[PDB]
């Protein structure tokens, strides 16, 4: 659905709009642009919390629709895997 | 089955054939057609994969038809012994 599917998302689905705002706070620097150390530091802190965030997305996405096979231990896995690249 | 196997075996099934298009691509190396180190460490990997596919399409198999006497403790001792080898 599209009314239901927004409620039972909470604030996991508008994680990715806010890692989106900060991204583009980034491209503008905040305080100065610059880059550097810290910069990529944020950034892939920022990375991990959307990562985070669509764990939980794709948990409700099985858990109000259907369990289907996605056996969450491969996505953790995965998420996992992206993370250390 | 045919259809209803090729449903229940999702992208676990695939994965096979996404390995063997990378093992063709590795045969033609992608950017420089050479090997060494490198190469054999990529290609340990994806058959790392190809093992951690074939585990969960096995582990569908006795699943979806028939337990029967198969024992996974056996067979991921066997995936662990050949990736050891
Ligand atoms: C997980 C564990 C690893 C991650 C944590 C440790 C690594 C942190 C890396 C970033 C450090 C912050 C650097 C900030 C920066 O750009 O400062 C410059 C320092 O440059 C430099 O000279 C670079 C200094 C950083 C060298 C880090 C070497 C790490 C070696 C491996 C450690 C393993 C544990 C400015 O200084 P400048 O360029 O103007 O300076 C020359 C004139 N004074
Ligand atoms: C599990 C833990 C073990 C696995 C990780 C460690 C081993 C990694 C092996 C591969 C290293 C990458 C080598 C890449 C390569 O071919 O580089 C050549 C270096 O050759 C060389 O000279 C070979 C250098 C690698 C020697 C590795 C010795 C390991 C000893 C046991 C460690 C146990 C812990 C090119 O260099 P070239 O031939 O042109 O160089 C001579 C002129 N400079």
Same mark, same amino acid.
């Given at each position: 659905?599209?009314?239901?599917?927004?409620?039972?998302?909470? *604030?996991?689905?508008?994680?990715?709009?806010?890692?989106?705002?900060?991204?583009?706070?980034?491209?503008?620097?905040?305080?100065?642009?610059?880059?550097?150390?810290?910069?990529?530091? *944020?950034?892939?802190?920022?990375?991990?919390?959307?990562? @985070?965030? *669509?764990? @939980?997305?794709?948990?409700? *996405?099985?858990?109000?629709?259907?369990?289907?096979?996605?056996?969450?231990?491969?996505?953790?896995?995965?998420?996992? @895997?992206?993370?250390?690249?």
């Amino acid at each position: 659905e599209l009314f239901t599917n927004n409620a039972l998302n909470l *604030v996991i689905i508008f994680g990715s709009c806010a890692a989106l705002i900060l991204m583009s706070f980034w491209f503008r620097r905040g305080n100065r642009k610059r880059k550097g150390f810290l910069f990529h530091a *944020v950034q892939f802190l920022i990375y991990t919390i959307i990562i @985070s965030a *669509v764990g @939980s997305i794709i948990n409700y *996405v099985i858990e109000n629709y259907k369990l289907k096979f996605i056996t969450p231990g491969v996505i953790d896995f995965i998420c996992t @895997s992206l993370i250390a690249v």
